[PDB]
Ligand binder design. Sequence first.
Ligand SMILES: CC(C)CN(C[C@@H](O)[C@H](Cc1ccccc1)NC(=O)O[C@H]1CCOC1)S(=O)(=O)c1ccc(N)cc1
Lengths: 114, 114
Amino acid sequence: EPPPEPRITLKVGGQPVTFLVDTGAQHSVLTQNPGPLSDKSAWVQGATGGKRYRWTTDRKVHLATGKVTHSFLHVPDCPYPLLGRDLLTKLKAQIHFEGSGAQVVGPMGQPLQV
Amino acid sequence: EPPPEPRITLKVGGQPVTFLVDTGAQHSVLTQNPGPLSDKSAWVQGATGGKRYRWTTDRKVHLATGKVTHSFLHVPDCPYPLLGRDLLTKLKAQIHFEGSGAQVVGPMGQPLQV
Ligand SMILES: CC(C)CN(C[C@@H](O)[C@H](Cc1ccccc1)NC(=O)O[C@H]1CCOC1)S(=O)(=O)c1ccc(N)cc1
């Protein structure tokens, strides 16, 4: 069920979501229970092929850097939710590989977990 | 055309490869003219579906610490090579978004002395 490290939990529309922190993902992804969906869609290129997916409606996302509004792709084919570059750029996150795992820290150097 | 940031160029098999640095990738990936392939394969579970891809035979990769022997998945459905968690752990790498764009550095903050 839970993603491998680097992972981070964020309050997304008043619910916790544990994301795989995914620097290779252009946009962020919800997989199950995405909440209300919008009418609009996008083509998603994955490693093994491409498919059309729907955008969620807007969600409040409680980033350590301050709350923002964000829409996610609803990708039920995807193994777990993905925190991609669209939100990492807002969070201004640092990702540190150390030991056999990885930890996320904020733009002030504050740990975002552990 | 380079991959988006965060990206890094490493010598593989003696020649430079520019990777998208990808914390969402369990294993590192090459995509074009990969050289000799093993008889072995892995199931790759992508955002949009899954299927199997071949492992390469061993490659010399020049990291910061010097040479490592590493096997890559050959995934021609991927638009660019991916440097995954396997090698990010070996490199003890840090990824920073707080700068403009995204940058990748070593265990002590040096853009990789690779
Ligand atoms: C889906 C995650 C869980 C795993 N993938 C890594 C991801 O970062 C993946 C990398 C990628 C970039 C550009 C085009 C195609 C693929 N980006 C991705 O699909 O972007 C989508 C999701 C939303 O935004 C768009 S993987 O490529 O399937 C993968 C799986 C196993 C190995 N060993 C290596 C790679």
